[PDB]
């Protein structure tokens, strides 16, 4: 019912050789998930690596942005729930197997062969991006996904092979913490993780801490971008920039509005290209 | 046009207007835009598309009958897709990363490995087009009484009802009629006996 | 006083001179060979047969389907015929031995109409469920199955020339298909009583399409409603139409009625009477077809009976 | 991407889908080839074979009984061969219902 | 698909029938609202032939006529069919070629 | 009517104008649409539905229908605007009559000479319909 020319294969997945051989099938194996007859591929990332040849379709990777035989994203390298829960939005899609999965999946399959280069909702809003999930995009990633999975008789100690047992040895796994939505155990510990990050203490007193050194303005950042990217958050009382230090002072009435600019501004306000230094005021005339 | 050619790729949806089902002006001998083309034209299209149906039923004879003898393929091919979705630092060096891509030689000892037994509902079809009759009369009160039908009385229905009403019993004229029932001749007959 | 009154051709009138009656069961279609010899016919008789165009004589009968015969055409390049009915069946009659040599089967139900490429070695069936079907010829495989409609397909035509293939239906819709893809070009919706009758002319574009109601006419691209013409209000089954200019139109109530190429004028509004073992109103016209020479014209009727008429060598049948 | 069942989804090897006929007779020149279609008049020729075919048909014995001589067989002649398409009163049906019935 | 054997001959050419004259009477009857109460018409047809087969005149006051005559015309085809099949199987177990007890006692209500 | 029924009142307006587009020659869909305008505001997409709704050419119950809907807002310059392609179509007297109405609505004077030699020259050049000069008759007295 498929056939394909080259599937997804996001990086994590093609190993740390650019030359690798591959060998192709014209009908393979069925999906985990709808059970459809792609073309599965199979190649060697690794001289300590298995094979890892093909988890998913081309149809059902084209839906999400998804890659091939892991079922990451292509544009970060992050599962599909925190994708759509840093959206809001879940392009639903459904369980059961002949209700209205294939169907949904035949029509949208059928209204996607012309273009093959976009998803088919995600086009509109992979655009407003980079703010929330870019705190944790991982660059040149641990290769522990591809090494091959755990082998028996060496839990046992009846393992006759040694060390020409090609898939691993002495790692005892744990039975503590290991599909498509839900539910991901680790995912949850990693959405604990991104929310008990590590801020400035809080200082027990009554909001009085509405100044802010906010510096690394060079020849990017200006007083009237730094004033409307603030009058967004709501109305000054006494602003000022300083250019021996390349810094600016802002503060607000009731400070609420500046609280979430410090939820803003924890390394994480990234406007005209830049990291910029934010450490606390004085909110002591000192 | 846009609200009647939804998903299609720049269809004929243009009908969509009510300019072009007035009737066109008064032609007699207009060649370029009346008359067919040479002989050159539809033979190049009858080329073209025989020789597309012809490789659609060699790919579809080597496909429903491909038992007998074929070779699979040479594959000597690379592929060479550039990574341009990750990398600044990812597999540092991966620039246009050329791969090899053979095929996985299928042994003739399998049966068929995936079950085709599925059986969906037929999906939402190509969108409605605009209709675009002509203006729908309504006829009178009396022309619609007209083109109407009695129930059924029939003996044998096997159906919603029987419908007995005091009236519609014999179903007939009067079961049986002659349009004269006699002839006289008869007569001419009978007494010429009796006599 | 009325637009396009002064400019319509003088077609001289159809009349009868020989009825052709032999068979036991509904006369549906009408074919002619391309060298001008005899012409092919089916029946509800289950027996088709074929009939000497000059004489007037059976040449020779021949039996083989389970059910109705709805359709049968001869080829031009090939020496054998085609014939298709209600019984699931295409038969593919050899005329050197006179037997059935392919067999087409594959269709979920019956066979209304089918129709050959003039050119290429392939053929266009439409059928009762919901499809018209492309059969290969020297392959017996179904190479596109054009699935579209809502309903029956009463008639299809295909020519050389894009567009190739014509299906009008009986979701009271026609279209035009492309016969590489499968996929339609061009869906046109019209006639508010279903359309059972289209038609090539064959010299140059602007085919017609057939309905009970405001009969029309169309074109090869992009369509186009060239004219509509007038009141021909009679439930309809076949258009034949004549490179001089003349076509003819034949319904279910026995009326029969000319047209002009020029202008659209009804010309003769002849009715055919029946043989005599018919009844007053059984007489319908389900076949109609020309010679090669087009000096003939040839109906079968629903009196099992084929009507032959010819020319009228007459000059005071002028247009008012 | 995706056909039928006739195409790859199936090996049903079905009994009467075989390559039976995998040559095509073309008409040649001595028949009604489309290359004498291209020129002949059609007209003239039918014309002639019209004209050469309608011409293809060019006492002391019984002084005591009753009736003495009824003078008639049919009334008229026996030829009719006419055609009623009703099949209960066509002359087949008539022969069928006096010949296989008593 | 399936073909048509001997034994699906009366249960193909009903179902045939009833199409053609549904989708007649669909492209026949004019602008009202309602067109044969779904099922009307084919009792009609059903009654004019069941009444013919007992040769009842089948007089039907109140009805349009096009609608009947279509149907006489319907149930005379009908009626063709079935005296040129029961004249053919007549013939074929008069010379012996079947000896089927379901065509012999079919010719005997069909004769 | 379920979308109407309800509060959303943009995807009515998305189920709308497709029905609309696609059923061209039905008028309940139009007529029950414009219903909804009617309870909605008397903006000028209104108008450009009405625009339409004239575009494919209905018949006189629709027609006089939006002129009695121009008369119902008091447009004085654009009813007189809308109104000039009305003749064109359906020349019948019961209109011949009802095109001489800014007589009894705005009394017209100069371009009501102009409708009258307009109500002269047309057709019943020799017959004069037996209706017109009835009513033209009975403003001139
Ligand atoms: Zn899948
Ligand atoms: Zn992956
Ligand atoms: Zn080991």
């Known amino acids: 019912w498929e056939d394909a020319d080259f599937p997804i294969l996001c990086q994590t997945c093609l190993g740390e050789n650019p030359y690798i051989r591959m060998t192709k099938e014209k009908y393979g194996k069925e999906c985990k998930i709808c059970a459809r007859p792609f073309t599965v591929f199979r190649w060697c990332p690794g001289v300590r690596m298995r094979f890892k040849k093909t988890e998913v379709c081309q149809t059902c990777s084209k839906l999400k942005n998804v890659c091939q035989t892991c079922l990451l994203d292509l544009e970060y390298g992050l599962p599909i729930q925190v994708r759509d829960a840093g959206l809001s939005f879940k392009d639903d899609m459904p369980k059961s197997d002949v209700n209205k999965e294939y169907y949904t999946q035949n029509m949208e399959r059928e209204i996607s062969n012309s273009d093959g280069t976009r998803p088919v909702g995600m086009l509109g809003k992979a655009t407003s991006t980079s703010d929330m999930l870019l705190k944790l995009a991982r660059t040149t990633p641990y290769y522990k996904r591809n090494r091959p999975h755990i082998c028996s008789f060496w839990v046992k100690g009846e393992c006759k092979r040694g060390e020409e047992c090609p898939y691993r040895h002495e790692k005892p796994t744990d039975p503590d913490d290991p599909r498509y939505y839900g539910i991901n155990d680790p995912v949850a510990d990693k959405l604990l993780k991104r929310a008990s990050t590590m801020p400035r203490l809080d200082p027990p007193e009554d909001k009085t801490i509405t100044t802010l050194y906010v510096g690394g303005l060079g020849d990017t950042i200006t007083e009237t971008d730094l004033r409307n990217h603030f009058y967004q958050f709501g109305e000054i009382r006494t602003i000022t920039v300083v250019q021996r230090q390349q810094c600016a002072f802002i503060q607000f009435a009731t400070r609420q509005a500046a609280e979430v600019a410090a939820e803003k501004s924890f390394n994480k306000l990234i406007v005209n290209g830049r990291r910029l230094n934010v450490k606390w005021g004085r909110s002591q005339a000192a | 046009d846009a609200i009647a050619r939804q998903g299609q790729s720049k269809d004929k949806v243009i009908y969509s207007k009510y300019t072009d089902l007035v009737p066109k002006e008064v032609m007699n001998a207009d060649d370029p835009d009346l008359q067919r083309p040479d002989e050159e034209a539809i033979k190049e299209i009858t080329e073209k598309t025989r020789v597309a149906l012809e490789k659609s039923v060699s790919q579809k004879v080597a496909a429903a009958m491909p038992v007998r003898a074929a070779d699979k393929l040479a594959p000597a091919q690379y592929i060479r897709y550039t990574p341009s979705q990750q990398g600044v630092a990812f597999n540092s060096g991966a620039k246009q990363r050329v791969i090899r891509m053979v095929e996985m030689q299928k042994d003739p000892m399998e049966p068929p490995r995936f079950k085709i037994n599925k059986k969906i509902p037929r999906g939402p079809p190509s969108p409605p087009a605009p209709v675009m009759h002509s203006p729908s009369r309504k006829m009178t009160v009396k022309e619609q009484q007209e083109w109407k039908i009695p129930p059924c009385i029939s003996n044998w229905k096997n159906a919603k009802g029987y419908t007995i009403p005091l009236d519609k019993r014999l179903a007939a004229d009067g079961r049986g009629l002659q349009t004269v029932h006699i002839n006289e001749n008869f007569a001419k007959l009978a007494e010429a006996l009796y006599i | 006083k009325a637009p396009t009154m002064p400019k319509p051709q003088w077609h001289p009138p159809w009349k009868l001179y020989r009825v052709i009656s032999g068979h036991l069961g509904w006369v549906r279609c009408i074919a002619v060979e391309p060298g001008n010899q005899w012409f092919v016919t089916g029946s509800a008789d289950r027996t088709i047969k074929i009939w000497d165009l000059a004489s007037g004589k059976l040449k020779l009968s021949l039996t083989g389907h389970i059910s109705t015969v709805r359709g049968v055409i001869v080829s031009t390049r090939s020496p054998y015929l085609f014939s298709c009915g209600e019984d699931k069946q295409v038969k593919c009659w050899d005329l050197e031995y006179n037997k059935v040599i392919r067999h087409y089967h594959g269709h979920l139900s019956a066979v209304y109409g089918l129709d050959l490429h003039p050119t290429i070695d392939v053929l266009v069936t439409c059928s009762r469920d919901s499809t018209a079907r492309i059969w290969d010829v020297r392959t017996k495989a179904s190479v596109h199955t054009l699935s579209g409609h809502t309903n029956a397909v009463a008639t299809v035509r295909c020519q050389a020339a894009e567009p190739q293939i014509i299906t009008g239906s009986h979701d009271t819709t026609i279209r035009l298909w492309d016969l590489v893809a499968g996929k339609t070009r061009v869906t046109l919706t019209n006639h508010k009583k279903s359309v059972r009758a289209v038609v090539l002319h064959p010299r140059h574009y602007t085919f017609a399409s057939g309905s009970p109601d405001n009969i029309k006419q169309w074109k090869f691209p992009d369509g186009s409603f060239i004219q509509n013409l007038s009141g021909h209000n009679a439930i309809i089954n076949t258009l034949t139409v004549n490179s001089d200019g003349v076509l003819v139109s034949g319904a279910d109530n026995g009326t029969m009625h000319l047209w002009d190429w020029r202008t659209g004028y009804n010309f003769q509004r002849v009715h055919a009477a029946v043989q005599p073992g018919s009844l007053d109103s059984e007489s319908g016209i389900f076949a109609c077809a020309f010679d090669q020479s087009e000096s003939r014209l040839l109906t079968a009727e629903a009196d099992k009976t084929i009507k032959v008429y010819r020319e009228d060598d007459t000059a005071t049948e002028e247009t008012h | 991407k995706g056909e039928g069942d006739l195409s790859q989804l199936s090996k049903q090897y079905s009994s009467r889908d075989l390559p039976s006929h995998t040559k095509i007779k073309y008409r040649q020149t001595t028949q009604d080839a489309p290359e004498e279609v291209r020129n002949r008049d059609f007209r003239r020729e039918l014309e002639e074979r019209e004209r050469a075919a309608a011409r293809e048909k060019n006492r002391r014995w019984d002084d005591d009984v009753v009736f003495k001589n009824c003078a008639k067989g049919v009334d008229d002649q026996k030829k009719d061969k006419r055609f009623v398409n009703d099949t209960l009163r066509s002359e087949f049906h008539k022969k069928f219902m006096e010949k296989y019935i008593k | ?111 | 009517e379920m979308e109407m029924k309800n509060r959303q009142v943009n995807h009515a307006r998305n189920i709308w104008d497709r029905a609309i587009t696609t059923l061209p020659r039905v008028n309940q869909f139009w007529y029950k649409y414009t219903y909804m305008e009617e309870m909605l505001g008397n903006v000028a997409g209104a108008r450009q539905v009405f625009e339409r709704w004239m575009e494919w050419q209905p018949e006189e119950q629709a027609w006089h229908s939006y002129i009695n809907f121009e008369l119902r807002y008091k447009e004085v310059d654009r009813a007189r605007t809308i109104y000039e392609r009305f003749v064109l179509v359906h020349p019948d007297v019961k209109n011949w009559i009802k095109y001489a109405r800014f007589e009894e609505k705005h009394a017209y004077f100069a371009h009501a000479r102009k409708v009258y030699e307009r109500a002269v020259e047309f057709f019943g050049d020799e017959h004069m319909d037996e209706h017109l000069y009835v009513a033209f008759a009975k403003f001139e007295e």
């Open chain 5, 1 to 111: 698909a399936k073909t048509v054997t001997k034994q699906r001959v009366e249960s193909h050419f009903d179902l045939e029938l009833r199409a053609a004259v549904m989708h007649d009477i669909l492209d026949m009857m004019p602008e009202g609202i309602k067109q044969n109460k779904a099922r009307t018409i084919l009792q009609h047809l059903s009654e004019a032939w069941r009444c013919w087969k007992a040769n009842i005149p089948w007089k039907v006051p109140g009805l349009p006529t096009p609608i009947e005559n279509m149907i006489l015309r319907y149930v005379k085809a009908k009626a063709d069919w079935w005296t040129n099949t029961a004249h053919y199987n007549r013939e074929r177990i008069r010379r012996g070629a079947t000896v089927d007890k379901t065509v012999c006692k079919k010719n005997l209500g069909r004769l």
